[PDB]
Ligand binder design. Structure first.
Ligand SMILES: [Cl-]
Length: 187
């Protein structure tokens, strides 16, 4: 049996963050009505890979052993960007990491060690770490890039308390494998 497996950093949404999203999302919906709010928020550390069932618990053990030694850190995510998935069947509005990118690279280096320990694919060669806020079916880049994006950025740039996005504090690493989740604290 083959289980889809993904490693990521959850984001624990501040109440301010959810108010920001309450303003951003309707604005974006004036361009693309079918956008869907994310229910939970994360920054990916891995590709979606496949693990045989037998190896899920050992993989999680190995991941926990490396992650729990890695220290919590702060990052900035205040740059709005438009993402698609590789097939262009989904479009995302996200917040791209600037300050703190170095720490995410170090985290990925550790995840990638675990991936190699299990014969799994290591992370994208040119990553842009990001927090996805909303998504839609299809390829909506044309509608969202340009004027909409500039307007979303102005909502972000005018947001108060700006510290919510300037100093986002990582807590934990999570893995989803099939229908199962596994979480672990950063040090
Ligand atoms: Cl639509």
């Amino acid at each position: 049996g083959n289980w889809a497996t993904h490693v990521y950093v959850p984001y624990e949404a501040k109440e301010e963050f959810l108010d920001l999203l309450d303003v951003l999302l309707p604005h974006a919906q004036t361009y693309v009505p079918r956008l869907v709010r994310m229910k939970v928020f994360h920054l990916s550390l891995s590709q979606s890979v496949v693990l045989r069932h037998h190896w899920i618990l050992p993989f999680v053990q190995a991941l926990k052993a490396r992650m729990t030694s890695f220290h919590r850190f702060f990052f900035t995510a205040n740059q709005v960007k438009i993402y698609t998935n590789q097939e262009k069947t989904r479009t995302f509005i996200g917040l791209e990491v600037t300050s703190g990118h170095a720490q995410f690279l170090d985290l990925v280096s550790e995840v990638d060690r675990v991936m190699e320990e299990f014969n799994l694919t290591t992370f994208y060669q040119d990553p842009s770490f990001h927090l996805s806020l909303a998504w839609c079916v299809g390829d909506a880049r044309l509608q969202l890039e340009g004027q909409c994006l500039q307007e979303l950025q102005a909502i972000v740039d005018g947001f108060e308390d700006a510290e919510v996005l300037l100093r986002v504090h990582t807590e934990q690493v999570r893995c989803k494998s099939g229908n199962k989740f596994f979480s672990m604290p950063l040090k």
